[PDB]
Write a protein that binds this DNA or RNA. Structure first.
Lengths: 49, 134, 52, 51, 116
RNA sequence: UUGAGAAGCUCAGACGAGUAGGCAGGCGUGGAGGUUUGUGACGAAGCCUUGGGCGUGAGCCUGGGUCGAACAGCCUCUAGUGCAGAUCUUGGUGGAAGUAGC
RNA sequence: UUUCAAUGGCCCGUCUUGAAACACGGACCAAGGAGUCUAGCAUCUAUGCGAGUGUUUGGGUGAUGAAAACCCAUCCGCGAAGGUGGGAACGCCCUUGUGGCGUGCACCAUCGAAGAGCAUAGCUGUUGGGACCCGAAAGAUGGUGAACCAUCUAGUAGCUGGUUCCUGCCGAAGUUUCCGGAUAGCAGAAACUCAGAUCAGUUUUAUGUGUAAAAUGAGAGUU
């Protein structure tokens, strides 16, 4: 008949532990796409610069 | 009822000024519809994702040809899909992630002013909307 | 060119900052309306003031 | 957005110089009197003292 | 009972001014002492790395610094922390060794009695 | 034909009670950043006046008399911001009354 | 402007009462004088960004107030975890118009089983906080010579009296129904779909007073 009330206390801990690692991964995955999804140089904009 | 936007984006009061003339001086319903939606609140203009646009043009029989999708509102991307198709899109706003993704692989992005000078009557344009429920 | 950036590149000094992208490109409306590509397709013109 | 590629640098004596600078990309950004007002409106309450 | 944060720009400048007098008193040495690298003691952050309090006695002896002098060249000591994993001993010994690479030590004059 | 403050100009028709209540546009006060390259000892602010005007109105502009050192229009910011009452607070002042009376 | 002539007009506010009657409050003038400040929640709108979002705990910095501005490290919070028809918009036409052929958004029917937030500002609403303003014997602690003083105290209210500039538009209900309430209804405010569609404190026709199907009008119905 299920675990313990304080053993469901850890059920948040096995829910919250993978928060920080997920968030850090989301930070680098967003940055990785940022390098990928960038506009090219537009070689015509160095005529005056 | 609604005949003046609640906005104060000065450039949206110039976009409306262009489509108030077009709506009343052409017989197309695309312009009368576009003008109405330039009056709608931010809540009533949902974001329309790139993938949702990509599905609509390439829907059922596909045959996208070179139709231009038009939406009043932002066009946020969808990183959950890798290969974006060629698209010509007109919208009030894009997201820098989305606009790069359209530009990098395929066609071009447009603002509502560049669509008007190309298809003032709504010539061969798909007018879409995002999911309102939210 | 480095403190603000560009609408494509990013300011070297302000991290991840791109200049805003506008609702329209050509902000001059009277050119948008009074252009050929629109004035060639509008229907006829009524009087500016209609006589009583 | 097409406008005025180059600007001219003036020396101390007031005479123009042959060198020039491309007009920065910032100088084409949107001009928003409402957005500047509602930001200056706020940012100007930040050096206030309490009474 | 209500607190206001009007002295928030006052307190920050007081802290900066408090750092500058410390730098004035102790010129060559850094305003901050070195701290080790440790891992937070929880399943949520255990894969992270942050700073500790000081270097344990196995971290000092392995790196090659006695525990008594370590307090004097700015290396702080934590008698409570211990090394259970060698990767924790390794990340902090090399942290000491890189510090002693950049550490200039000023000689001190020493009493030299005529006899012995 | 000049009538693009497109937030403009123009045309047509019907309509108009109002409590509770809902919506909208404005007038006014103190101070705040911008502005009028603003006003002021050749007279600011204020005050009175059966002077002249403006606005449906809140209100405003001006003439005269006093007056003597400051003040305002415009765009925004802001709040200890609008009075006929509360046996309202404070000060002043009448009738009662030259009365009760001493 | 004062005055006269002719016509007129029961004292104002509150409360009461259908209404008054009332009972109140008002000797006069000036000044003071009452939805405010804040935390929480939800809504609408505006703005920035958008599968993201939020610099201001703090650090960096700021020579011309340096309590401003400007910049970002490590966290963290809140998010993120298929066919059928009707359909907006468009194209092709083609007896054109009429319509058809299509492509079919939002969404709704049907059969079924391609994220939209976050943050700031405003508005209105609500809950607390002294809580629109004024007013009920207090009580308690501690003092002074049953009495008196000082504070806690912004103690307590369904109640009483008051709550301040103008114009414009819309404008009820005044009560069913269950049951102090949840409904409803009236009024709005938004979003929708249609005038080739439905309606009506309507009237006829006729079938058996009800019901069903012609005129007279109005666009009507939803969430």
């Amino acid at each position: 008949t299920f675990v313990s009330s304080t053993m469901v206390r850890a059920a948040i801990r096995n829910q919250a532990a993978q928060r920080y690692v997920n968030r850090q991964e989301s930070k680098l995955e967003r940055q990785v796409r940022a390098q990928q999804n960038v506009i090219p140089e537009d070689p015509l904009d160095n005529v005056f610069a | 009822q609604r005949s003046k936007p609640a906005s104060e984006n000065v450039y949206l009061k110039l976009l409306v000024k262009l489509y108030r003339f077009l709506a009343r001086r052409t017989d197309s319903r695309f312009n009368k519809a576009i003008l109405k939606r330039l009056f709608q609140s931010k809540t009533n203009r949902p974001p329309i994702s790139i993938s949702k646009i990509a599905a609509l043009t390439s829907r059922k029989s596909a045959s996208s040809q070179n139709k231009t999708t038009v939406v009043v509102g932002t066009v946020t991307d969808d990183e959950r899909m890798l290969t974006v198709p060629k698209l010509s899109i007109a919208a009030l706003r894009f997201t820098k992630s989305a606009r790069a993704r359209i530009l990098k692989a395929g066609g071009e992005v447009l603002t509502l002013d560049q669509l008007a000078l190309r298809a003032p009557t709504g010539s061969n344009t798909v007018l879409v909307r995002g999911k309102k429920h939210a | 060119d480095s403190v603000f950036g560009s609408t494509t590149e990013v300011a070297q000094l302000k991290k991840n900052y791109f200049l805003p992208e506008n609702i329209i490109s050509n902000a001059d409306v009277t050119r948008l309306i009074n252009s050929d590509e629109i004035q060639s397709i509008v229907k006829a013109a009524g009087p500016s003031r209609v006589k009583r | 957005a097409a406008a005025r590629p180059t600007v001219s640098i003036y020396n101390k004596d007031g005479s123009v110089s042959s060198e020039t600078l491309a007009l920065p990309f910032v100088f084409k950004a949107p001009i928003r009197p409402d957005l500047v007002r509602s930001v200056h409106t706020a940012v100007a309450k930040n050096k206030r003292q309490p009474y | 009972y209500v607190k206001t944060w009007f002295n928030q720009p006052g307190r920050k400048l007081r802290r900066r001014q408090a750092r500058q007098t410390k730098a004035a008193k102790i010129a060559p040495r850094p305003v901050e002492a070195i701290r080790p690298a440790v891992k937070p003691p929880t399943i949520r952050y255990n894969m992270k790395v942050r700073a500790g309090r000081g270097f344990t006695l196995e971290e000092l002896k392995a790196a090659g610094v006695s525990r008594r002098v370590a307090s004097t060249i700015g290396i702080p000591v934590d008698h409570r922390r211990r090394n259970r994993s060698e990767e924790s001993l390794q990340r902090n010994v090399e942290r000491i060794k890189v510090y002693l690479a950049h550490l200039i030590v000023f000689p001190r004059k020493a009493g030299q009695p005529k006899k012995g």
